[PDB]
């Protein structure tokens, strides 16, 4: 088969080659005999016959006349399907411009001639003339002229002057260019020019011209001369039942075009006046514009139905276009759908299948088996027998169904666990019975949510659905290493009720001879389900070298746990089933079984757990009545206290003691406190209230009140969803998001009056609307993410590299949010981890860190691990397997072939439907400081003179547990290495004020300070001290504006005090609005304060992060290390110049004046230091801080957003999306290579080019990495078909055509469209073979 797809412009000769006959008339079919109208969009001698092996004239109507052409009518006697391929060609009487190559915003013709698009559209409208090589006499080549100017020029010159208008003039301009000479001249201009905007324009036009020259295209081909016509079948004219014809809009546009062309040719023949022929030419231009791409130039022309008709463009692009409706996914045979039910008797790997639907699906299989068995003489007899539904067909169907998996698939398949293959089990009825547990994976609830079943047909597909997609194989999610078979909401309640203890139940305290005796006692009713007893249990352990050893002991348990123990497999220990067994305990029991035994034991264990949980929940009869919501006895007392408090606060407001805001805050505070008290009283009276006796007075126990059982167990409940039943339901928010002063003090057990219920509808409608729009935004985000990752396929075993990120546990500022184990588990390291006792290493360089290695690390208490990350993988066209790590739903290293890009995209996108002072030390440890500059203050304490100081709590074990960021100028109560106790405020600072603390001591002298010009006169009347306030630039006189107020500290002798350590005198050039309090001749110490200068969403934030959109406040960083200074200020901005001590000085930056600064004109700041302050732009982080910095920032941000809502996403996926995000690079130096100076080239191409150049003696080029948003990181792709599906299609296809690009069908998308095998899954090897046979 073919290997690559080429796309390029169409020359008129090529269009002639495609076609098979010109169309000369608008007719379609005769109304009396609906047969092709000659020379009409439906012909017979041009676009093939209408009937198989039959001519239109009917002279030859036999197969034996194959290939002949009937003399009467000239029809080639062939198949009718040839009508699907033959094309025509319409010869325009005038050239017509192609709208795609005219009105695409980077208009190809617009910048080809360097002519403004307005002046081109004016020409196409016959509104003005244009010189066409008129000679260097009086007018220029590209000069435009109006009617009067053209007439004056014609009077001036009759000859040696050529001017025209319209498509003819544009085509002449295109034909008259010299691409090579123009390219050389423009390259010279680019070399000489310096203007950056002019530079970019010249490089863009150079790139266009060079692309044209390299490709076989010619500029004149842009202008349309010969118009191809789609084959008739693709625009059908079928007669609807009853003599009515259904036709597409391509026909209307083509008819319009042919009619206009006929009128134009007739007018030219008749020699009509200039105005009429010009009008007809313009109208033909508009008609062809509508046919090519309707609704772009002018307003879309409608039909008789008053709607914008669909043209070829609308058929290509759009969600209804061929790409996204008939290529990337199509309706599928051997398929069906229905509603679902529970069907708990099923095993984990078989779903029900209605008899009727199953019969319809597997019909060809039934026919094959029947004609094999001989019961059907012919296929028609078999069809009739199946249709009548004979009794023999059922045995055949049950024979076929035996081993033939069917793929169940829900409608929103967000992630790969939304298509799973079960083994059908025939069921009477019309419901697709589905195993209950898998609902958790599907998020399928039996409220009428429908499901589709597909049937794998081929042998390979059957084995695929048997070995990859089976439900029993997906016992572990792709996003995180936790199971996805957690017993969900009813099985869990059954186990919880069945694994419990009652202080005194029937038959408590006897001794049993094992689980069998316990079950036997329970069934007869002699001993209650849960009564404390002693049982002899044998538990097995595999501590030996794969050999199980048993140990028998007389454990103390309940009869319920004794019954449960018969289901747990051999290996697990008894202590797992010796507790309350809620939802976390049971899920962790499943996880322990999976990790200790394997897969099959855990599958059978899950099935048994489900069966027994259902059975014993049934035996419980766990109900819920109106006596199971015990409203607290002290609720009314709390509400009375709250009302008294709010009344007192209102009275205080009447006295004016409290302002409106303060009283509002106090009232909300008291209401929150009262609500919390009520909830606590509720829980105390609900969870422990049950009291019984056992040979004594009384004793308390965990209560069996049904709602407490359904809340504590985690089975469809929570402490939050309760307290709206018994205790008051708190406060409700208004549409603005505010919190209403008066909460609603009635729960659901007591009913809500009119106003309180009406208040409690803002929340409900806000939630419903948020969900309704969140599903849409999440779908869009998932599509973009998976179309940015739709190339990542693991093709290598190891890239052989050392680079990697440094993974460390994350600390928000307080306690650790996530330890090192969760983030590091199942990844390949980058260097030999070594214990704090660095005399020996800890782990090898390239060992997959499984559980044992992580536990060893925890024992040795390591802080950071240099781990290889996908962002750093050195492979091209993929990533090394060792770079990715553990497979996440396989317990081993990733498998060479898994399409990590798609699974990572789906993992990130699925949760989208689940989204929208001082310091206090907690633990006892030693203070540590990182990147800190500090000096002793006037009072003997320590003051930080650095910006990026980080405090850490190094416990006695040497591991950080707490981290803090300190602003500039903070007083430390203690010092580094000083052990401190919990609750100690080691440091404190003022949230307001910006200090200018100094570094020297001595008398204060008024240096470069002038009243009025630099400062004003003001006195703090509160204390009577005169303060020296610096005026702003917009107020101070220009005379003193050049002068910056400063404070040079000197001694009593007049000598200038020099900065400690350094030699420069200490001068602090104060900025505007600085309030110096201390006056002249005032002695000050080091660090004395001179001026106390005064001062998102869940899903949208993730969308912005992956789009890499510059935030509202683009906090600018230190572009280069060096001392700061101010240059020539301008009106709108300040000139900040950063000059290194020994580097290049000239760089400067314009900063808006209103922006707040953080450098006092003398702080030497290294590269990357935040100059402004605010949210960072990821592009800045990538450009300055490197590659690891931006990936770290993105990972941290997205993980914060996700963990905020309690969703886990292993960081590999975000890293993969990041690797795809920053994949392009812009050349800085061309070097010995052959790359343009500023051209933006894919990273892999430049990388391999540089590597293979360095293999030679030539010097490689320098590249600056670039970061592009997901949408733009997708639209700029090597292949054009892959980028032609998910985005603007007109732009992509136009760019591909003009560039003459060439796609090679290498990704996960182009192969999908073309129908060939996939280079990711089972087809991987095949593709490799296809590569190996080639070039061999």
């Amino acid at each position: 088969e073919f290997d690559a797809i080429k796309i390029a412009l169409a020359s008129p000769d090529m269009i002639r080659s495609w076609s098979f006959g010109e169309v000369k008339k608008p007719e379609t079919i005769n109304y009396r005999t609906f047969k092709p109208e000659r020379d009409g969009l439906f012909c017979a001698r041009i676009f093939g016959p209408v009937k198989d092996y039959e001519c239109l004239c009917g002279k030859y109507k036999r197969l034996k006349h194959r290939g002949v052409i009937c003399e009467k009518c000239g029809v080639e006697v062939t198949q009718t399907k040839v009508r699907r391929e033959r094309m025509g060609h319409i010869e325009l009487a005038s050239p017509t411009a192609h709208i795609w190559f005219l009105k695409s915003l980077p208009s190809r013709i617009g910048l080809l001639l360097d002519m403004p698009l307005r002046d081109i559209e004016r020409v196409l409208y016959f509104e003005s003339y244009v010189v066409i090589e008129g000679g260097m006499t009086n007018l220029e080549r590209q000069q435009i002229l109006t009617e009067e100017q053209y007439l004056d020029a014609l009077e001036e010159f009759g000859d040696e002057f050529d001017a025209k208008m319209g498509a003819e003039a544009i085509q002449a301009l295109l034909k008259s260019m010299d691409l090579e000479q123009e390219c050389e001249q423009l390259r010279e201009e680019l070399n000489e020019t310096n203007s950056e905007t002019k530079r970019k324009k010249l490089t863009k036009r150079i790139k266009l011209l060079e692309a044209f020259v390299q490709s076989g295209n010619k500029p004149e081909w842009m202008i349309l001369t010969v118009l191809p016509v789609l084959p008739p079948d693709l625009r059908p004219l079928v007669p609807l039942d009853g003599g009515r014809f259904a036709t597409s809009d391509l026909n209307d546009l083509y008819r319009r075009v042919i009619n206009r062309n006929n009128r134009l040719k007739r007018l030219l023949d008749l020699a009509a006046p200039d105005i009429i022929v010009r009008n007809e030419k313009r109208m033909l231009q508009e008609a062809v514009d509508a046919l090519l791409d309707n609704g772009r130039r002018g307003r879309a022309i409608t039909g008789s139905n008053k709607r914008p008709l669909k043209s070829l463009a609308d058929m290509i692009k759009g969600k209804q276009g061929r790409f996204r409706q008939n290529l990337l996914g199509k309706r599928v045979d051997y398929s069906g759908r229905s509603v679902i039910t529970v069907g708990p008797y099923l095993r984990l790997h078989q779903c029900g299948l209605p008899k009727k639907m199953a019969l319809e699906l597997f019909k060809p299989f039934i026919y094959g088996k029947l004609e094999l068995r001989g019961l059907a003489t012919t296929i028609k007899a078999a069809k009739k027998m199946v249709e009548r539904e004979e009794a023999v067909v059922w045995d055949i169907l049950d024979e076929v169904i035996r081993e033939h998996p069917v793929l169940l698939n829900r409608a929103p398949t967000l992630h790969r666990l939304g298509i799973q293959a079960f083994e059908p089990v025939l069921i009477e009825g019309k419901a697709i019975q589905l195993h209950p547990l898998v609902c958790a994976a599907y998020n399928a609830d039996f409220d009428g949510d429908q499901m589709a079943v597909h049937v794998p047909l081929t042998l390979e597909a059957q084995l695929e659905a048997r070995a990859l997609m089976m439900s029993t194989n997906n016992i572990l999610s792709p996003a995180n290493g936790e199971p996805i078979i957690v017993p969900s909401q009813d099985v869990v309640l059954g186990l919880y009720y069945m694994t419990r203890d009652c202080v005194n139940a029937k038959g408590e305290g006897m001794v049993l001879t094992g689980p069998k005796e316990a079950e036997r006692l329970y069934r007869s009713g002699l001993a209650s389900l849960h009564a404390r007893v002693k049982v002899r249990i044998t538990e097995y352990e595999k501590d030996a070298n794969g050999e199980l050893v048993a140990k028998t002991s007389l454990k103390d348990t309940t009869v319920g746990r004794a019954i449960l123990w018969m289901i747990v497999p051999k290996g697990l220990p008894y202590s797992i089933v010796n507790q309350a067994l809620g939802k976390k305990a049971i899920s962790k029991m499943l996880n322990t079984c999976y990790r200790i035994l394997g897969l099959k034991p855990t599958v059978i264990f899950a099935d048994q757990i489900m069966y027994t949980g259902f059975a014993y929940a049934a035996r419980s009869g766990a109900s819920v009545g109106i006596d199971d919501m015990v409203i607290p006895e002290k609720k009314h007392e709390i509400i009375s206290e709250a009302e008294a408090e709010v009344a007192e606060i209102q009275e205080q407001f009447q006295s004016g003691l409290v302002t409106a805001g303060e009283r509002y805050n106090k009232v909300i505070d008291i209401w929150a406190a009262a609500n919390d008290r009520v909830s606590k009283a509720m829980m105390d009276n609900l969870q422990t209230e049950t009291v019984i006796n056992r040979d004594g007075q009384e004793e308390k126990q965990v209560s069996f009140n049904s709602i407490y059982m359904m809340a504590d167990s985690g089975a469809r409940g929570s402490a939050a969803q309760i307290r709206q039943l018994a205790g008051m339901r708190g406060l409700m928010a208004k549409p603005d998001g505010s919190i209403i002063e008066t909460p609603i003090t009635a729960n659901f057990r007591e009913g809500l009056n009119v106003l309180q219920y009406f208040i409690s509808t803002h929340g409900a409608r806000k939630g419903l609307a948020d969900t309704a729009l969140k599903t849409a935004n999440s779908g869009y985000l998932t599509r973009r993410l998976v179309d940015v990752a739709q190339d990542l396929v693991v093709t290598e075993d190891d890239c052989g590299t050392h680079e990697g990120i440094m993974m460390t546990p994350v600390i928000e500022g307080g306690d650790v949010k996530e330890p090192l184990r969760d983030r590091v588990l199942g990844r390949v390291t980058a260097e030999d981890v070594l214990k704090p006792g660095t005399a020996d290493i800890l782990v090898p360089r390239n060992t997959l860190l499984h559980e044992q290695w992580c536990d060893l690390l925890e024992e040795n208490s390591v802080d950071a691990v240099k781990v290889r990350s996908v962002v750093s993988c050195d492979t091209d066209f993929g990533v090394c397997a060792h770079c990715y790590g553990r497979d996440l739903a396989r317990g081993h290293i990733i498998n060479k072939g898994e399409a990590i890009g798609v699974i990572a995209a789906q993992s990130i996108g699925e949760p989208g439907t689940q989204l929208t002072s001082s310091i206090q030390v907690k633990n006892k440890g030693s203070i540590k400081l990182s990147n800190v500059k500090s000096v002793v203050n006037s009072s003997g304490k320590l003051v930080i003179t650095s910006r990026n100081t980080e405090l850490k709590l190094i416990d006695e074990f040497g591991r950080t547990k707490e981290s803090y960021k300190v602003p500039y100028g903070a007083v430390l109560a203690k010092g580094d290495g000083e052990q401190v106790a919990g609750g100690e405020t080691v440091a404190n600072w003022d949230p307001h004020t910006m200090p200018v603390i100094t570094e020297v001591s001595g008398f204060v002298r008024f240096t470069d300070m002038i009243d009025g010009q630099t400062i004003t006169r003001q006195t703090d009347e509160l204390t009577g001290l005169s303060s020296l306030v610096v005026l702003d630039s917009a107020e101070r006189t220009a005379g003193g504006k050049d002068l910056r107020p400063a404070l040079k500290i000197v001694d009593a002798q007049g000598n200038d005090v020099l900065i400690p350590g350094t030699d420069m005198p200490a001068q602090y050039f104060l900025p505007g609005k600085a309030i110096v309090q201390l006056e002249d001749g005032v002695q000050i110490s080091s660090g004395d304060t001179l001026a106390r200068i005064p001062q998102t969403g869940g899903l949208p934030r993730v969308a912005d992060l992956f789009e890499a959109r510059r935030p509202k406040e683009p906090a600018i960083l230190a572009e280069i290390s060096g001392i700061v200074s101010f240059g020539k200020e301008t009106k709108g901005k300040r000139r900040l110049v950063i000059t290194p001590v020994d580097g290049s000085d000239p760089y400067e930056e314009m900063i808006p004046k209103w922006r707040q600064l953080n450098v006092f004109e003398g702080e030497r700041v290294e590269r990357g230091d935040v100059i402004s302050d605010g949210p960072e732009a990821p592009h800045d982080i990538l450009r300055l801080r490197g590659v690891h910095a931006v990936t770290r920032y993105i990972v941290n941000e997205v993980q914060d957003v996700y963990r905020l809502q309690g969703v886990k996403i292993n960081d590999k996926h975000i890293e993969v999306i990041v690797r795809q995000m920053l994949r392009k690079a812009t050349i800085v130096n061309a070097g010995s290579s052959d790359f343009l100076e500023g051209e933006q080239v894919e990273y892999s191409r430049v990388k391999i080019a540089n590597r293979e150049l360095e293999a030679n003696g030539k010097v490689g080029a320098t590249y600056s990495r670039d970061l592009l948003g997901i949408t733009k990181a997708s639209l700029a792709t090597e292949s054009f078909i892959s980028a032609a599906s998910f985005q603007e299609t007109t732009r992509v296809l136009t760019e591909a055509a003009v560039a003459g690009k060439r796609d090679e069908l290498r990704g996960l998308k182009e192969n999908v469209i073309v129908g060939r095998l996939i280079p990711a899954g089972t087809g991987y090897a095949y593709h490799q073979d296809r590569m190996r046979r080639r070039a061999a």
Binding site: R402, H404, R466, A467, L599, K600, V603, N895, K896, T1322
Partner: protein, 70 residues
């Protein structure tokens, strides 16, 4: 009757050579040229091939060896 393929992936690595090898073996068994090795017990060619792979009497190497013998 079969449930899982864990032993199969343990025998043949990559869980993708498994699918292809089982597919080819089942294809030989299905078209009426060849005969099975493991005693058929009412299963289908796919599950029989997976039984052969799991028990360890066939893999890509053995399959190619039996092919080149013929």
């Amino acid at each position: 009757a079969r449930v899982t393929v864990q032993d199969a992936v343990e025998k043949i690595g990559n869980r993708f050579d498994l699918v292809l090898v089982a597919a080819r073996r089942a294809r030989q068994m299905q078209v009426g040229g060849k005969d099975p090795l493991v005693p058929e017990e009412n299963d289908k060619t796919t599950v029989i091939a997976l039984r052969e792979i799991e028990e360890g009497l066939i893999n890509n190497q053995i399959l190619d060896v039996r092919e080149r013998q013929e």
